[PDB]
Each structure stands twice: as C-alpha cells, then as structure tokens.
Amino acid sequence: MVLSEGEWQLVLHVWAKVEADVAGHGQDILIRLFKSHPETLEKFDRVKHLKTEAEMKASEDLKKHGVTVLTALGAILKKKGHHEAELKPLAQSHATKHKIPIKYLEFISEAIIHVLHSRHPGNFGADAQGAMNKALELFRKDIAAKYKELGYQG
C-alpha cells in the first residue's frame, strides 16, 4: 500500500503536535493500551506488577517505555514509507526477544488513534485519522512480513 504525499502531510502535521510533549503522549498511550487490553502489560517485566492507573501514572519506567516507543515510531513515520532499515532491528527484537503478536500491534495502533483524537481534535478530523490509520496499517503490514522472514509471524 502507498500513502500519497497529502496523506503523509496529514500524518506529519499531527505528529509535530505529539512531539511537543513526547513523554506525556507516551504515558497516555501505554496506559490506554494496558487498561483496554491488560494482557499486554504482562509483556513488560519492569512494569507487570502495576495494579492501578494511578500507579501507572507514577511509574518512571512506564514513562521511559512510552518515550522509547514514540521516538522509534516517529523516526519510522518521518521516512514516509522508506523505512526498511528502521524496521529490521525492531522486527527482530519484537518477534524473537519480546514475542509480540501482530494482534498486540493492532491494539497499540488503536490506543494511538484514541489518544490523538482526544488531545488533538482540531488536527485529527476524519481525513487526518484515515491517513494515520493508513500509515499504521502500512507499518503493521511491513512488520508482519518481516516476522514471517524471521520465522515468527505472530
């Protein structure tokens, strides 16, 4: 699948807003993920034991993870589809070290979309959301292909 330049512009335009507060958005997203799909919290050894949203908000490790996710994703989105190099080490660690099924990447995509909608309503109308969904689908499709090469496809 291929995004048009106009769809990339919509994606990179909200993303410039996200980057004003990387740590805050990373928290919101990972908390949304863990509340909506608690099975995902089990994958994170530093943070599995957290019981409430208040504990989550307080956690420095959760905040570090959030910043790590959003910084890596940002770097991918700014490639506008030319992201083969960036994807290789990410696919390898998530397939063979962490063991993250594709389904979980769908869940975090849903969390990203929810949080951008809440925090950026003026820059995240229907066409911008469509374009973000297309960019994240492209990311997932390319990761799934790499999982398969690596021997996992989960």
Structural contact between residues 126 and 68, judged by C-beta atoms closer than 8 angstroms: no
Which residue bears the tokens 């003026």? 122
Report the alpha-carbon distance of residue 63 to residue 29 in Å, rounded: 10
Residue 65 labelled as part of a binding site: yes
> Which residue, chain included where needed, has tokens 């999982």?
147
| Per CB under 6 A, 115 contacts ligand HEM | no
How many chain residues are in contact with ligand HEM, going by CB under 6 A?
18
x-marked contacts with ligand HEM along 35-74 as a string, rule CB under 6 A? -----x--xxxx------------------x--xx--xx-
Determine the interface stretch with ligand HEM among 3-11, 12-20, 100-108, 127-135 (rule: CB under 6 A). Answer: 100-108
Instruction: Using CB under 6 A, pick the residue from 87, 105, 144, 150 that binds ligand HEM.
Output: 105
Helix (H, G, I), strand (E, B) or coil at 82: coil
Q: Which residues belong to the annotated binding site for heme b?
A: 94
